[PDB]
Design a protein around this nucleic acid. Structure first.
Ligand SMILES: [K+]
Ligand SMILES: [K+]
Ligand SMILES: [K+]
Ligand SMILES: [K+]
Ligand SMILES: [K+]
Ligand SMILES: [K+]
Ligand SMILES: [K+]
Ligand SMILES: [K+]
Ligand SMILES: [K+]
Ligand SMILES: [K+]
Ligand SMILES: [K+]
Ligand SMILES: [K+]
Ligand SMILES: [K+]
Ligand SMILES: [K+]
Ligand SMILES: [Mg+2]
Ligand SMILES: [Mg+2]
Ligand SMILES: [Mg+2]
Ligand SMILES: [Mg+2]
Ligand SMILES: [Mg+2]
Ligand SMILES: [Mg+2]
Ligand SMILES: [Mg+2]
Ligand SMILES: [Mg+2]
Ligand SMILES: [Mg+2]
Ligand SMILES: [Mg+2]
Ligand SMILES: [Mg+2]
Ligand SMILES: [Mg+2]
Ligand SMILES: [Mg+2]
Ligand SMILES: [Mg+2]
Ligand SMILES: [Mg+2]
Ligand SMILES: [Mg+2]
Ligand SMILES: [Mg+2]
Ligand SMILES: [Mg+2]
Ligand SMILES: [Mg+2]
Ligand SMILES: [Mg+2]
Ligand SMILES: [Mg+2]
Ligand SMILES: [Mg+2]
Ligand SMILES: [Mg+2]
Ligand SMILES: [Mg+2]
Ligand SMILES: [Mg+2]
Ligand SMILES: [Mg+2]
Ligand SMILES: [Mg+2]
Ligand SMILES: [Mg+2]
Ligand SMILES: [Mg+2]
Ligand SMILES: [Mg+2]
Ligand SMILES: [Mg+2]
Ligand SMILES: [Mg+2]
Ligand SMILES: [Mg+2]
Ligand SMILES: [Zn+2]
Lengths: 137, 136, 38, 123
RNA sequence: GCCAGGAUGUUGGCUUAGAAGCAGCCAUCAUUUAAAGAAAGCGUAAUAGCUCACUGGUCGAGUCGGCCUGCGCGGAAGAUG
RNA sequence: UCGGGUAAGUUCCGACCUGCACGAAUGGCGUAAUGAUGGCCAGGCUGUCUCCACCCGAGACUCAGUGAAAUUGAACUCGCU
RNA sequence: AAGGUACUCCGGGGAUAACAGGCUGAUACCGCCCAAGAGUUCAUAUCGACGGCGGUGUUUGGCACCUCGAUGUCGGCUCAUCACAUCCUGGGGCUGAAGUAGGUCCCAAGGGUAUGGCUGUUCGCCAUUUAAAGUGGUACGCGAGCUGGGUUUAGAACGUCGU
């Protein structure tokens, strides 16, 4: 029940009956096509990923990176901005929930971060399975 | 799980497991795991031990299983009385006597083989020993 | 303290000692490696 | 001497008129609550448009008993009815703003100092 | 036991956000040597650091690990005493 | 299952229909009145209970008189493991 | 030459079932061995696949040894007593133990260890307590101590089955 995104549809062939040809009929036909596509195109769930920019003293760098790699996140890289190393990373939005408290816990309240949506990535199969179950009921 | 593809008869008498084994030499590889005790090796046990040793050698060399579970073992369902005919076949076993080479291995160092056989032996209900192929 | 039937060395610093008829694994590097046979 | 099932009157303006004790708090197999003891109550009768409604499970402090209180000289003070003052389940502070009828010096604590101030008489 | 050294192309390369003996995968080397693993451990984002093996010195006689086998040890909690 | 009643209701009351396996004189569905009839609720009332205390009588106990019964292989008829 | 009997009856059997005991321990419950993995990294803080070895008598069972010239059977009440595989309180190791609070294991049986709603219930769910509301054995402890709601006589009805 989630909007399908990042899919191309190519109308290569079709048919019509002058008498029974109605735009509404073609709209229904299109829907049926998408349905059968799902049965064969392996639809997967995607999760919103956020680019996280964390600035902290180098002393707490290891902990920050560990937290990211624990929250199904990947470190995109790091940079020694000023006296506080800046770490760039992409982490699922759902995972990022509660990062503020943990960040401050790990950085002794000397850590700051900014998160902005980057891309949509496939949800882990296990997590995805749960999402389907939840949406189903 | 090894099991006969077809059999002449479905069920077999209990029988006994006396005597010494035939096939007491490493005949296909360089190293072997030999049974020193007497008992029944089930197919599941044979599989578990194989999977263990295969992982240990990390898909290097060759492994020969010298034992096949050809004997059908029956059991009665629970809450059923005695008689009313022999029970149904539940699993397949191999009768083992002292001296039987169970597994052989080649294409690995002895140290790896000794380790791999140790891992497999832990999955086996009988006491075992490491053996090497001899000239005669 | 790990109380097990199978007690053994888990490192190079782990040591097996018998005290008052009990096999024990004392370690100077890791407290997790401390074991008692029982 | 209040126990489970005992019906009490309300000595405040929370809206409750009749409450029933459903638990004597503060120990295993504790039988009774006297003046100054906190009980768990359910509201049996309430007035329309009050602070509390019928069926509510909250706390109360007992402030008057027919059994009464003993004083250190051997004296006794008894009342004609069992009366309680409703408290918040969490804060255990009075829900009402006014106290009706006399109370006793047994409520002279930091917890129940509001009741003493609002009380028309302390005996 | 004790006193020292324990390296150089080189962070082997690839991959890896980073991977430098010590993530993984390929390699798999040569050099100075008394000897030093393209690393057996601890440790680090990665490095470092901390070792070790190896080796040299010291010390001054045995020492080390398999095999077979006898007797013991742990594994081993229950209801009236 | 939903709703009501309770702080909390496998019972009760009102619905729903998915009637394992209602149904029309081996009657169907209602029905005022009636019932030592079945279920459920409330007020009053209370030793029913929290938790029992005291008291008055009849026994029980002691003395005198009278005087049974079931049962019973024999007994010098303890605990524990 | 077919059935019914809870309206029943007689002779017998513990030669043969139901209850409890016994033997057994498949099953059950408890513990251990191996360690693929999970645990950001890291088998073994916690956990643990595939397999393996035990313990208890403790569930469902197997057997038919005791009792059929009778061994009263569920639940409650009253009153208990033992085990320890410990629920609380005491001591301690490890921890993925900052503190607070926990996890896990070891030692420990001295004492302690809810009231209610519903139901015959044990139980369970629910309300509200408590330091905690332990788990088992004791003829599933206890009817020559109580109860008689459950359950299994004779009355009656429904659904169902049967002419
Ligand atoms: K008729
Ligand atoms: K009629
Ligand atoms: K009636
Ligand atoms: K007949
Ligand atoms: K065990
Ligand atoms: K670890
Ligand atoms: K009998
Ligand atoms: K008991
Ligand atoms: K602890
Ligand atoms: K105790
Ligand atoms: K019995
Ligand atoms: K009874
Ligand atoms: K008796
Ligand atoms: K009696
Ligand atoms: Mg022994
Ligand atoms: Mg004893
Ligand atoms: Mg309801
Ligand atoms: Mg009732
Ligand atoms: Mg109804
Ligand atoms: Mg009918
Ligand atoms: Mg008709
Ligand atoms: Mg008719
Ligand atoms: Mg009708
Ligand atoms: Mg007399
Ligand atoms: Mg005796
Ligand atoms: Mg008879
Ligand atoms: Mg018999
Ligand atoms: Mg007999
Ligand atoms: Mg029996
Ligand atoms: Mg397993
Ligand atoms: Mg049995
Ligand atoms: Mg027989
Ligand atoms: Mg008997
Ligand atoms: Mg007799
Ligand atoms: Mg113990
Ligand atoms: Mg005791
Ligand atoms: Mg004792
Ligand atoms: Mg003492
Ligand atoms: Mg209850
Ligand atoms: Mg009993
Ligand atoms: Mg009991
Ligand atoms: Mg009686
Ligand atoms: Mg009795
Ligand atoms: Mg009855
Ligand atoms: Mg009848
Ligand atoms: Mg009919
Ligand atoms: Mg008929
Ligand atoms: Zn260690």
């Amino acid at each position: 029940g989630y909007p399908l995104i990042d899919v191309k549809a190519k109308l290569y062939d079709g048919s019509y009956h002058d008498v029974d040809s109605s735009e509404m009929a073609f709209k229904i036909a299109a829907s049926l096509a998408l349905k059968e596509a799902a049965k064969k195109c392996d639809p997967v769930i995607l999760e919103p990923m956020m680019k996280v920019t964390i600035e902290m003293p180098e002393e707490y760098m290891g902990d920050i990176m560990g937290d990211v790699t624990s929250r199904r996140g990947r470190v995109d890289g790091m940079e020694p901005r000023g006296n506080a190393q800046v770490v760039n990373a992409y982490v699922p939005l759902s995972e990022m929930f509660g990062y503020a408290t943990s960040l401050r816990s790990n950085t002794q309240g000397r850590g700051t971060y900014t998160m902005y949506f980057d891309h949509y990535a496939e949800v882990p199969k296990s997590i995805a399975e749960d999402i389907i179950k939840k949406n189903k009921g | 799980m090894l099991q006969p593809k077809r059999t002449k008869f479905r069920k077999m008498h209990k029988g006994r497991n006396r005597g010494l084994a035939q096939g007491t030499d490493v005949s296909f590889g360089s190293f072997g795991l030999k049974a020193v005790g007497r008992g029944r090796l089930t197919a599941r046990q044979i599989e578990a031990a194989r999977r263990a040793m295969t992982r240990a050698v990390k898909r290097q060399g060759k492994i020969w299983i010298r034992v096949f579970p050809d004997k059908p073992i029956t059991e009665k369902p629970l809450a059923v009385r005695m008689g009313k005919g022999k029970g149904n076949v539940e699993y397949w076993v191999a009768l083992i006597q002292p001296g039987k080479v169970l597994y052989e291995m080649d294409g690995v160092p002895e140290e790896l083989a000794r380790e791999a056989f140790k891992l497999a032996a832990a999955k086996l209900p009988i006491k075992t020993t490491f053996v090497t192929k001899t000239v005669m | 303290m790990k109380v097990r039937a199978s007690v053994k060395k888990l490192c190079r610093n782990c040591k097996i000692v018998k005290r008052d008829g009990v096999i024990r694994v004392i370690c100077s590097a890791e407290p997790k490696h401390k074991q008692r046979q029982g | 001497m209040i126990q489970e099932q005992t019906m009490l009157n309300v000595a405040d303006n929370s809206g409750a008129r009749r409450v029933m004790c459903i638990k004597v708090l503060g120990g295993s197999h504790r039988r009774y609550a006297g003046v100054g003891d906190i009980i768990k109550i359910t509201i049996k009768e309430a007035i329309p448009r009050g602070k509390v409604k019928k069926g509510d499970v909250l706390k109360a402090v007992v402030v008057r008993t027919k059994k009464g209180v003993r004083r250190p000289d051997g004296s006794v003070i008894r009342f004609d009815g069992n009366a309680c003052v409703l408290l918040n389940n969490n804060s255990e502070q009075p829900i009402g703003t006014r106290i009706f009828g006399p109370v006793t010096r047994e409520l002279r604590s930091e917890k129940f100092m509001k009741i003493i101030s609002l009380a028309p008489e302390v005996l």
